[PDB]
Structure 1
Amino acid sequence: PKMKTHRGSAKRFKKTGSGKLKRSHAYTSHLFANKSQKQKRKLRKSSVVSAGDFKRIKQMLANI
């Protein structure tokens, strides 16, 4: 059996150049009146999965 990808993570991560992963940010769904503006605008931008989580994850996103 050819191995199934994981759709829940395929809907959330993108494989950039040089093999890293592009991820969104948490804490951006429905609580915004309470957080300061600075953390909100930093939170709008995207980030990249760290090394240990990548070491765990790499297998589960093998097929882009």
Structure 2
Amino acid sequence: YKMKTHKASAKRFRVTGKGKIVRRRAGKQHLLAKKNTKRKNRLSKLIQVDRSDYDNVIGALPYLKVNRKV
């Protein structure tokens, strides 16, 4: 019956105003002392999910309002 949302995944993929899926980067929870100032700044920020993995993410949670660019 009416699709349950994959609320394990949902909590890692937000969608932006224009409609792109966005995630947080992996790496910077602990063992921070040994990494640079530089790379922690790139690991702070959000970027798109790669076009490859859209299929799995959209497929998991089907109430997103997500526009693959068309």
Query: TM-score, normalising length from structure 2?
Result: 0.79
Residue 57 of structure 2 aligns with an amino acid whose one-letter code is: I
**Aligned ranges for residues 1-64 of structure 1 at < 5 Å?**
1-64=1-64
More displaced 10-residue stretch of structure 1: 3-12 or 52-61: 52-61
3-state SS, counterpart of residue 28 of structure 2:
coil
Q: Deviations over 1:1-60 (max 9, x none)?
A: 111111111111111234320110100111101111111111111111000111232211
4+ residue segments displaced more than 6 Å: none
Answer with 48-57 or 16-25: which moved more. 16-25
TM-score normalised to the size of structure 1?
A: 0.85
SS in 2 for 1:8: coil
> What amino acid does structure 1 have at the position aligned with 2:60?
M
Bigger share in helix: 1
Q: Aligned Cα RMSD in Å? A: 1.3
Structure 1: give runs of 5+ residues left out of the alignment. none
Query: What stretches of structure 2 of length at least 5 have no aligned partner?
Result: 65-70
